[PDB]
Design a protein around this ligand. Structure first.
Ligand code: HEM
Ligand code: HEM
Ligand SMILES: CN(C)c1ccc(CCNCc2ccc3ccc(N)nc3c2)cc1
Ligand SMILES: CN(C)c1ccc(CCNCc2ccc3ccc(N)nc3c2)cc1
Ligand SMILES: C[C@H](O)[C@H](O)[C@H]1CNc2nc(N)[nH]c(=O)c2N1
Ligand SMILES: C[C@H](O)[C@H](O)[C@H]1CNc2nc(N)[nH]c(=O)c2N1
Ligand SMILES: [Zn+2]
Lengths: 408, 413
């Protein structure tokens, strides 16, 4: 059946047919919703996935059933038949990557989906090569502050024994350190990976914002350590437009958000290493990285300098300190000519994107739990937007951290 | 289905295991290939249909009270059965009904205040026959629940649906709400939410004051007759003028709200029986008023005005002038209710208490259905503990259900 979604502030109702195209399971059943749960090949398996992907490729370019289509199908079959896998054409790789982004139910920045610089790194064979490709990515994507969306794609998985993996969760992330007293210096989310790096020979400065090094694994081999040239790492000192004491807090963050731990699945093929990068929505930094209890956890300190009444929770002193911090972040990146979107602008763009997608594509999978920003929820349009969620392919999936499987 | 489902809290790392979901009764709207978790909403029963529903419930009751398989249990089954054979329905004892109402609350996956579920004063109004009697019962509800501002949760239960042609209904969505009036210029006065019901009221003969906070009259249907209008005694309606602990100008906004949230349009389903008029009340979470009632664009929509008075730069959105005003408004709401000693809970306290509730439910009950989309407060989500808490959502019965608005279905006499 067709399904309607309503926006309760504007009363707009879109009709969803696209959901009928999916085959992967969301996790829910008719009796149990898991919408707030974070995580709910052979030749025989490989061809239909290949065939479905090529079919939608040639359908997207309005040449379905054509000679090129037929031959390509024959070509891919004849290759899986004799190699137990197949290689994507350059065209398919780019279409595939942009469509994985287009299909990411959790991404509020999808209005940018078709503007994506794809770097083919399928000829890479070593970690040194990986470091080269990654360094080129960062310099390109950063672009002196005028960030650009990029993705660098390393060889697809073969037997599982020879995966390319980027061990860092993001190409640029700060170190975290378990102190003697049991506290954490720096970013607590990275304490494990920070220790693995040190175990491998990395000499840590042991400060609050130390850039982690790259840990790259090629062809299933032991991973290797590489320092990103500091000139390639754009960072922003966080200050406040009215509060001149905010710089005293000693806050900074990096400009490039570049996720490196995911798995890009195309046409039945698995790219275990596909670090991609966009730009920030301020709350990522302002709300989550800085204020989460398990993260930098600065709320109390900020509210102290704000001299707020902190005895009872009903002074909303946390809510006060929160808005001010996120103002600082947006003010800093802007003042430094580094690309950054606030959550009002971002969510609006997403609504506008949704309407585009419904009109041209008959739907748009969207994960309300993730789309709604972690602050000021209902004063953004997305809060009032009914969304449907389903899994379309190609896509970005999660994968085991490498240090749980890899044998040295 | 899997018999053991795990949920994690990513802030504390606590994992809980859910087994209660196995006793799920109705469809959620979701399937294996699609999730409807952000969808707001995704002629009677018969003899053969009612037996399993009643027995299911009765078994559950005698289970709670540790008398399962007893003489009293088996006799109650025999009595309910015979009643359904001979009258096509059955009547709940006063104990079964109270249990039932408390558990519909306990089962409410969308409700962040369920830690209070066991403290619910239940008024049995099954002897009601007229609209005037409904109004009597409803006035008594309000006075007791209000309690001079030290509010107490309560429910009044009217006779159950029988053949569908004699339903009791409260046409109000809440017993206390403000009128909305559509002007010929397109602008609305009062509360945009209640414009349709306000119009219905004027049709039925209400002479509206036509102001910004005018308490709606009650529209009451008993036994399937046409509804009748009654004015709630003003002395029974506790209100709070909204002011700010720091901004003197905030009182000049002329803002007030009522103390008692009193939802009156849900259906209460217990053991296959349908109580189409079951007004219930609790007390407010601050955000309901400060964020939703006040700042929603389709509602009172005061953000711009509050921002103007805060002298905020409102050209660009990245100044966060909206977020700045929203917090202040919510501080004022909380500050006012507390100053007038009217019970109210901030979103930090409530979400925090619900986590404790949820954990205890997993412990003593094997689970606790919850709607993350609804539980997480509409402001500062990630800085409350429920944002980080994985929840499973599913429908247990007894339950509060939605039902069509009565003017859509009522055959006028
Ligand atoms: C261009 C500007 C972009 C913006 C403003 C943006 C915004 C966001 C935000 C705010 C999230 C929430 C993630 C979190 O809270 O941890 C997200 C998630 C996500 N984004 Fe985008 N993004 C952008 C670019 C991209 C690109 C270039 C890709 C891939 C090619 C992408 C794919 C994804 C995926 C797969 C997720 C899911 C995250 C997860 O599963 O953990 N985004 N995005
Ligand atoms: C005692 C204090 C209570 C608090 C703080 C509380 C809190 C809340 C809040 C904040 C909501 C969201 C409402 C909305 O966003 O529109 C809600 C929903 C709900 N509550 Fe509670 N609640 C309380 C009492 C009760 C009681 C006494 C009952 C019934 C006996 C109840 C049953 C429900 C139900 C069925 C919903 C779903 C609302 C809907 O579907 O529209 N609650 N609660
Ligand atoms: C494994 N777990 C629990 C877990 C998995 C993913 C996350 C979120 C990681 N994704 C962050 C992320 C991913 C892609 C992005 C794209 C653009 C952007 N501005 N931020 C972005 C941020 C958190 C926890
Ligand atoms: C028909 N639609 C679109 C619609 C349905 C329900 C809602 C939410 C109404 N729920 C209100 C409600 C219900 C129970 C409550 C219990 C306690 C409390 N403080 N507020 C409470 C508030 C909004 C729109
Ligand atoms: C339990 C819940 O699913 C988890 O906390 C989610 C909630 N929504 C989120 N939304 C975004 N954008 N990012 C997140 O990490 C999360 N975390
Ligand atoms: C579209 C979305 O499902 C809708 O706006 C919901 C979201 N969560 C909510 N949560 C609460 N508590 N109350 C609401 O009215 C809503 N509205
Ligand atoms: Zn679901």
């Amino acid at each position: 059946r067709f399904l309607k979604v309503k926006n309760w502030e504007t009363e707009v109702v879109l009709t969803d047919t696209l959901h009928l195209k999916s085959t992967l399971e969301t996790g829910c059943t008719e009796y149990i919703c898991m919408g707030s749960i974070m995580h709910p090949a052979t030749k025989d398996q490989l061809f239909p996935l290949a065939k479905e992907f090529i079919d939608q490729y040639y359908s997207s370019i309005k040449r379905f059933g054509s000679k090129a289509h037929m031959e390509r199908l024959e070509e891919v079959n004849k290759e899986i038949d004799t190699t137990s896998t197949y290689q994507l054409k350059d065209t398919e790789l780019i279409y595939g990557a942009k469509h994985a982004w287009r299909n990411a139910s959790r991404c509020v920045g999808r209005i940018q989906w078709s503007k994506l610089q794809v770097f083919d790194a399928r000829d890479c064979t070593t970690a040194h090569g990986m470091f080269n490709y990654i360094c080129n990515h960062v310099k390109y994507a950063t672009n002196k502050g005028n960030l650009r969306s990029a993705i660098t794609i390393f060889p697809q998985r073969t037997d599982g024994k020879h995966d390319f993996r980027v061990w860092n969760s993001q190409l640029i992330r700060y170190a975290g350190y378990k102190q003697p007293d049991g506290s954490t210096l720096g970013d607590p989310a990275n304490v494990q990976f920070t220790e693995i790096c040190i175990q491998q020979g990395w000499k840590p400065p042991r400060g609050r914002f130390d850039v982690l090094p790259l840990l790259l694994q090629a062809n299933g081999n032991d991973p290797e350590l590489f320092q990103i040239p500091p000139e390639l790492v754009l960072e922003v000192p966080i200050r406040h437009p009215k509060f001149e004491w905010f710089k005293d807090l000693g806050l900074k963050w990096y400009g490039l958000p570049a996720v490196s731990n995911m798995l890009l699945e195309i046409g039945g093929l698995e790219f275990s290493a596909c670090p991609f990068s966009g730009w920030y929505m301020g709350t990522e930094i302002g709300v989550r990285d800085y204020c989460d209890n398990s993260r930098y956890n600065i709320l109390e300190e900020v509210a102290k300098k704000m001299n707020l009444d902190m005895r009872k929770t009903s002074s909303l002193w946390k809510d006060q300190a929160l808005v001010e911090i996120n103002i600082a972040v947006l003010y800093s990146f802007q003042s430094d000519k580094v690309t950054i979107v606030d959550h009002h602008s971002a969510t609006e763009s997403f609504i506008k994107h949704m309407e585009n997608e419904y009109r041209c594509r008959g739907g748009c999978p969207a994960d309300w739990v993730w789309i709604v920003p972690p602050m000021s929820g209902s004063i953004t349009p997305v809060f009032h937007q009914e969304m449907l969620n389903y899994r379309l392919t190609p896509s970005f999936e999660y994968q085991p951290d490498p240090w749980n499987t890899h044998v040295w």
